[PDB]
Structure formats: structure tokens, C-alpha cells
Design a protein around this motif. Structure first.
Motif, mmCIF file in Angstrom:
data_model
loop_
_atom_site.group_PDB
_atom_site.id
_atom_site.type_symbol
_atom_site.label_atom_id
_atom_site.label_comp_id
_atom_site.label_asym_id
_atom_site.label_seq_id
_atom_site.Cartn_x
_atom_site.Cartn_y
_atom_site.Cartn_z
ATOM 1 N N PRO A 46 7.220 -78.941 60.215
ATOM 2 C CA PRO A 46 5.804 -78.177 58.962
ATOM 3 C C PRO A 46 6.545 -76.944 59.266
ATOM 4 O O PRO A 46 5.594 -75.744 58.228
ATOM 5 C CB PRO A 46 4.625 -78.595 59.311
ATOM 6 C CG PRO A 46 4.833 -79.557 60.838
ATOM 7 C CD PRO A 46 6.393 -79.658 60.847
ATOM 8 N N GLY A 47 7.079 -76.300 60.503
ATOM 9 C CA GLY A 47 7.042 -75.333 60.678
ATOM 10 C C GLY A 47 7.627 -75.277 61.965
ATOM 11 O O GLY A 47 7.461 -75.779 62.596
ATOM 12 N N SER A 48 6.711 -74.265 61.975
ATOM 13 C CA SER A 48 7.020 -73.417 63.853
ATOM 14 C C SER A 48 6.312 -74.168 64.707
ATOM 15 O O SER A 48 5.254 -74.586 64.499
ATOM 16 C CB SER A 48 7.128 -71.794 63.757
ATOM 17 O OG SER A 48 7.609 -70.889 63.569
ATOM 18 N N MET A 49 6.400 -74.848 65.408
ATOM 19 C CA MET A 49 5.708 -75.736 66.590
ATOM 20 C C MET A 49 4.754 -74.460 66.940
ATOM 21 O O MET A 49 4.108 -74.202 68.348
ATOM 22 C CB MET A 49 6.726 -76.500 67.534
ATOM 23 C CG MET A 49 7.439 -77.523 67.094
ATOM 24 S SD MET A 49 7.530 -78.653 65.543
ATOM 25 C CE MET A 49 7.877 -79.767 65.228
ATOM 26 N N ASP A 93 4.363 -83.869 56.135
ATOM 27 C CA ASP A 93 5.151 -85.233 55.393
ATOM 28 C C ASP A 93 5.050 -85.174 54.296
ATOM 29 O O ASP A 93 5.947 -85.081 53.360
ATOM 30 C CB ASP A 93 6.190 -86.070 55.913
ATOM 31 C CG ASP A 93 6.925 -87.285 54.749
ATOM 32 O OD1 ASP A 93 8.257 -86.928 55.455
ATOM 33 O OD2 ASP A 93 5.948 -88.012 54.701
ATOM 34 N N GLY A 94 3.359 -85.349 54.011
ATOM 35 C CA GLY A 94 2.926 -85.356 52.820
ATOM 36 C C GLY A 94 2.016 -87.251 52.556
ATOM 37 O O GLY A 94 1.060 -87.505 51.578
ATOM 38 N N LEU A 146 -6.323 -79.618 51.129
ATOM 39 C CA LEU A 146 -5.222 -79.737 52.322
ATOM 40 C C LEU A 146 -5.113 -79.026 53.187
ATOM 41 O O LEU A 146 -4.611 -77.588 52.845
ATOM 42 C CB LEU A 146 -4.570 -80.365 50.590
ATOM 43 C CG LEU A 146 -2.608 -80.448 52.033
ATOM 44 C CD1 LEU A 146 -1.865 -81.989 51.939
ATOM 45 C CD2 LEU A 146 -1.874 -79.464 53.168
ATOM 46 N N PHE A 147 -6.208 -79.283 54.443
ATOM 47 C CA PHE A 147 -6.304 -78.288 55.435
ATOM 48 C C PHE A 147 -5.049 -78.665 56.516
ATOM 49 O O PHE A 147 -5.656 -79.551 57.631
ATOM 50 C CB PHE A 147 -7.483 -78.238 55.443
ATOM 51 C CG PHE A 147 -8.128 -76.661 56.162
ATOM 52 C CD1 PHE A 147 -8.235 -75.280 56.051
ATOM 53 C CD2 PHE A 147 -7.569 -77.138 57.776
ATOM 54 C CE1 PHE A 147 -8.273 -73.998 56.398
ATOM 55 C CE2 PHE A 147 -8.523 -75.285 58.853
ATOM 56 C CZ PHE A 147 -8.770 -74.264 57.613
ATOM 57 N N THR A 148 -4.155 -77.914 57.198
ATOM 58 C CA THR A 148 -3.267 -77.885 57.866
ATOM 59 C C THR A 148 -4.299 -78.080 59.665
ATOM 60 O O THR A 148 -4.203 -76.907 59.446
ATOM 61 C CB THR A 148 -1.975 -76.973 57.582
ATOM 62 O OG1 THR A 148 -1.491 -77.630 56.934
ATOM 63 C CG2 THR A 148 -0.970 -78.090 59.158
ATOM 64 N N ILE A 149 -3.514 -79.088 60.444
ATOM 65 C CA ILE A 149 -4.673 -78.749 61.607
ATOM 66 C C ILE A 149 -3.786 -78.839 62.319
ATOM 67 O O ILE A 149 -3.217 -79.438 62.393
ATOM 68 C CB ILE A 149 -6.278 -79.768 61.778
ATOM 69 C CG1 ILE A 149 -6.906 -79.721 60.968
ATOM 70 C CG2 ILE A 149 -6.884 -79.623 63.062
ATOM 71 C CD1 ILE A 149 -7.526 -78.596 60.723
#
Length: 130
Positions: A19-22, A56-57, A97-100
Motif C-alpha cells: 500500500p506504500g512505505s512500510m 489490497d481491496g 475507508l480509513f487506513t489503520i
């Protein structure tokens, strides 16, 4: 004549693809916008709803289909600051949609083999009411 041949073909260098930088990743994509005029305030018992989802979705489970609204005092240590911020930043009748990031949730620890330790997990936050 330069017509940009843009095509998502592949990735030669993945740089740990994901999803991006770890690190502490936070993306917010609203699925359903709310009143917008309504304002959630701390100290108050709010009526919320969540959906577990992978970056991922693919959804972990559609808890929306379960039709179960949870309730907790906004601003209190009921939940992680991630979810607190999620519900605090959203509006009534809205779901986003909130990325935790793994560091804030149990995603770091994992727990079940479904969640690989240090996995950033996405939760759809839904504010039904206060």
C-alpha cells in the motif's frame, strides 16, 4: 509526437510492494458522504459502524451486512486513536475507508494467521449517529 504510452505493465523494482512505505500509512476514501452539516463532538456517546478490509481491496468481512451499529464515547479511550480520529474527522450518515497503520492497531501483533504480523489494516468507518 509525444503521446505518453502509459500502461500499468509491471514493476521492475518493487521496493517492498504494498500500500506504500512500510510506516504509519493513512489514506481516507469516503464510500458514502454524510450530511456534512452535522458535527461529531467529543464526550458524547456516538453510534458507529466498521468494516474490516485489506489494503489490497479485498474485504476481511462485510460487517455492514451484519447490520450491527456499535456505540462508544468519542474522545474516550474506548478504541485506538486511529478509529477515534476516523470517527472524529467524519460526519453523520457518512462512511469512509480509513487506513489503520499496523503500529496503531493489533495489525503489528497480528494474532490470527489471516493477519501477517506488522500488517497495515484498512477499516471502513461509518458514523450512523450520536
Amino acid at each position: 509526437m509525444a503521446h505518453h504510452h502509459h500502461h500499468h505493465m509491471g514493476t521492475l523494482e518493487a521496493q517492498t510492494q504494498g500500500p506504500g512505505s512500510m510506516s504509519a500509512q493513512l489514506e481516507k476514501k469516503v464510500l458514502t458522504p454524510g450530511d456534512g452539516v452535522t458535527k461529531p463532538q467529543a464526550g458524547k456517546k456516538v453510534t458507529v459502524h466498521y468494516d474490516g478490509r485489506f489494503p489490497d481491496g479485498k474485504q476481511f468481512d462485510s460487517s455492514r451486512s451484519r447490520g450491527k451499529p456499535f456505540q462508544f464515547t468519542l474522545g474516550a479511550g474506548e478504541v485506538i486513536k486511529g478509529w477515534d480520529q476516523g470517527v472524529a474527522t467524519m460526519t453523520l450518515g457518512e462512511k469512509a475507508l480509513f487506513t489503520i497503520p499496523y503500529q496503531l492497531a493489533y495489525g503489528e501483533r497480528g494474532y490470527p494467521p489471516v493477519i501477517p504480523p506488522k500488517a497495515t489494516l484498512v477499516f471502513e468507518v461509518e458514523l450512523l449517529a450520536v
